[PDB]
Amino acid sequence: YGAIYSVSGPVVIAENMIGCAMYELVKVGHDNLVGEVIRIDGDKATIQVYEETAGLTVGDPVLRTGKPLSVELGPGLMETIYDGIQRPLKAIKEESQSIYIPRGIDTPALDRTIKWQFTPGKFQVGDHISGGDIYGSVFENSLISSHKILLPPRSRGTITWIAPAGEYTLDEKILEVEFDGKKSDFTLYHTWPVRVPRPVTEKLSADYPLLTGQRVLDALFPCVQGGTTCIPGAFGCGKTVISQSLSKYSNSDAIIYVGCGERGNEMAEVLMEFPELYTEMSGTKEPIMKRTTLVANTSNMPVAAREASIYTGITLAEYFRDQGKNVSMIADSSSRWAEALREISGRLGEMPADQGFPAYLGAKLASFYERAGKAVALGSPDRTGSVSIVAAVSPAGGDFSDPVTTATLGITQVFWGLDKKLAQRKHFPSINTSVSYSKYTNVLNKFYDSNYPEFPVLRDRMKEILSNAEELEQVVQLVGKSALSDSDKITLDVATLIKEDFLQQNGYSTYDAFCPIWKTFDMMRAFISYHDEAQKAVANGANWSKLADSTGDVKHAVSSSKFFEPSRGEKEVHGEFEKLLSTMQERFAESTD
Template identity: 55%
Template sequence: MPTKVSAFGPMGAWHGFPPIRVREDFSQWAVGSVQDLHDQLGAAHGDFTVVSPPPGPGTQHRPVGCALIGVNGGSRLLAGWQVRVGHDKLVGEIIKLENTNASIQVYEDTSGLTVGDPVERRKQPLSVELGPGIVDNIFDGIQRPLHAISDLTKDVYIPRGVDVASLNADKKWRYKPVNFREGDPISGGDIFGLVHENDILHSHKIMCPPNVFGTVVKIYGAGTDGNESFTLKDTVLEVRDDTTGVTHKLGLSHMWPVRKPRPVAEKLAGNVALTTGQRIIDALFPSVLGGTCAVPGAFGCGKTVISQALSKHSNSDAIVYVGCGERGNEMAEVLNDFPELTMTVNDREVPIMKRTTLVANTSNMPVAAREASIYTGITLAEYFRDQGMNVSMMADSTSRWAEALREISGRLGEMPADSGYPAYLGARLAAFYERAGRVACLGSPKREGSVTVVGAVSPPGGDFSDPVTAATLGIVQVFWGLDKKLAQRKHFPSVNWLISYTKYMRVLEPFFNKIDPEYSTLRTKCQEILQKEDNLTEIVQLVGKESLSEDQKVIMEVAKIIREDFLQQNAFSDYDFTCPLVKSVGMLRSIILFYNLSQKAIADSPPDAKVTWAQIKTSMNPVLQKIIQTKFQLPKQPEAELKAFFSGLDEEVEQAFQTLSD
């Protein structure tokens, strides 16, 4: 029996065909019937035979939405399966099934599709290829390699329907089989080989796909030296399924559906801090490796700079940076900057791109592919996690992803909720953030990995009551709220210390106490000073500083030092582009020590010879300047040198106050 199909493209346009039974131009939508011909070579073929308008004034037909079920011959379609639409074989995905109707989302511009164009069904959901070659690469939202497409087409634009392998299938990789012999049982997640990818990922682990298990029948690659070269198309291991008797031929890569989380053995609690190189984050609002973080802020607040700083300087083993619906210039900046940045590995400077994967789905690319790009990025991150690595995924920005979700929901005719977003927005966001975490990986040998998700949120006008921001804050454990007023004052990172928070402090206390046993006290005191300053600011604006008591003047002046010299950071300087944890804690300790001794000197002075802030500032000016200038210590100094410097400074501060009291 014939079945109905509707398809809508990313920009919502099908052009190039005459409207049928249409009194107005409804060319944005196309609804037709698809007749299944045969189930050949794993693909169902059909074509469009009727085009009808969407519901609207002057129409007599109301299309139900979408389509491809009840295909002749008994074969059925499933939601999430891939299809190829038209002669150009545009990439599409079935996103909804209802009775005999299915909705197809096309991830490319659908201009020019006409009645009679073929539709081809692939027997797999939207998937990505996982294997060597992912890092130091840039993909679009559905894992098409942009460099390879550029080299193939010699064009700055991506042609419609271009079909290029996600990973280079012709490149030979040096492969070494490990851990298994013929006859051994094997199951999903087991590591059976190693590939040297680059100087950072020197041992890319080749794993058995999570849905494969059985007995090892044949091992390839065990040459005289234990190493041989293979491409991604070659078989490196044969596994027989003892239940069905089917033999699986495993290569260096495998496919995995993007919307299905990769299985793990056990979820674990995070216990190691994510160091970012940003003092306000590392010292006041830290996250764990495997945490969930949100960075909401209005236009121009520095969301992208924070995301890029985390990509450049965090203590992660691999980085997945997803540019989802943001400006193309930002991805271009990443492409220009990252190859110039280096990290030291075995006394050699190695480009940081060797640990980075970029998923670019910028604002001038198809809207619908934004919805897939977030899932593509998190699936790539989970793959590296399963190898036992700590991975950071930057999603810039989840608001654009939610807008794509809103557009698709609207096309399906679903009931809108707040601001037009679908009612299941919170559930989708939660399902995405739940894929983060520290885990015990599936398979042998035993290993642990983590995925840290940092989601930038772009609320319109900086309004944090926006549905996406509100839903995100109910899910994530760390909130770095960016402030428009701080950004306008050129205070960067513009993280507002009064509204930001972290829920990981209790689990991170043992980690920070190893660096400095007084860390928890220092952090609490710092936040207390900043809060008191905020309370006193209104009084100062009304009646001036002279009305304050001496201890309140100390609060105002020390808070100014904390704001301008500790929390503020110049990402483009050679001394402040990043800040190691030892330097951050050392600076904070020196400032809080100065504050405590100042308050003690004022409190302990006799009434007839009261010590004032003016006296302290005058007599302690050289020491105060040294504290202010601690940020000029170069971050690449050895840790022992930094510790020695700050220990000497603390002794100098104590000696100066001793002299003052005498």
């Protein structure tokens, strides 16, 4: 149909376009590379072609698909690995003998090879149905049906034909819909453009616990179900590490991992590691992976795949939420997504803003976060779901004022830090309290108090300790440890202990084991207890030396507690933590008189 007028860089101009929508997907040239229409100048439409071009001729054919860059939502997304332009990566390996994308491959959006078992819904013939309703379900996992087959949004009618229970393939018809005669047939998959968010019934308040399973978050600033999060940091920050832990431990029923332009070895590691390791609520065959789907993309792999990653992933997440699942979406990193834009603004010749990144940055990040939150699912059964977004970014040389980090921080309500100095001693991730806040902290403590722990009371003293520690440390540096008071010495020690035992997730035998809110609470009871009794003791006359040497064993025990597997009496209160409480009491008394 159209004919290539020019290729200047990855940017292609082709005449004989009478139309085309925004960001319309095309297959360009005989090669059949990915593209999207960004703009139209005259009859000539400028289309960026984002798969590497080293050999596209002028006057090669241009085929419009007729709809924007879109995603399929349907059966077999779980335990199936995809790119950001929704090509199954497994399908490519077999055919192509190119494990990664080579230049010029056209592989359909889903797997049309794997038959799936369809069972019929509470909607039988003659019944009205509307988008996001559970028309049926597909068995995908050993424990649960993952993919609840939804009628798509922006479709409606009464069902003339319901296919019976049995096996069918993806392209075969299984549903016929009545509304102005045959409105159309439906297939197992449905399509949606990824620049349109999916519509919900209502959004609902975020105040319900999100257990990410990592001690350091639970202790300092927990997230919420419905959360939005920013995390900075630059290599040796433990972001890959916290993703793997996050996937294993996560209470959410789906986790969607987004690789924005990753090392490739990093993607190779996490893929291998989900079936090698076991889940905490049990998992039969590829345990963790059963709950994990990967969108993975490397650093030179298509600029479209990388740009679309956050939208392909957020659309997936919204679909699981409309299904009635709790989703934890990890994107890593939005900063690598931001580089895809920096590149897009130069090529096109549009004028950018500061740091050579465009101004449209701020809108695009904001749109992604607002589609997240906790909501009541669209569809007649009605369920509760969430999309809680944890989004990684990277500072430009210790500069946190770079447009990407500042923008994400603008939109977020939770900020979790990352300190370079503390990572060097091996404490990554490294969250303090002067580089981090959470608005959810206040409601979240109220909900944890209820469940069992004393957390809110301990949280306040814990915050104070860290806040004083920093200030007191500046005096040690400059003046020396000769200007201190004895209570201030106490604040320094307890603090050093907190730094190691929560923030560090680095091994010494084994990478640290699942620590819940309950575990995390016990650690806090022992550190806070140490501090109170010791200050009383010094106030009331007593040696510093006597008190520190005496705590001794108790300190070794809390350090290593996290390596030991949870439950050692109970999850709730361990016998190992219970006993220390007595030891402090016995010491306090010896010291006083």
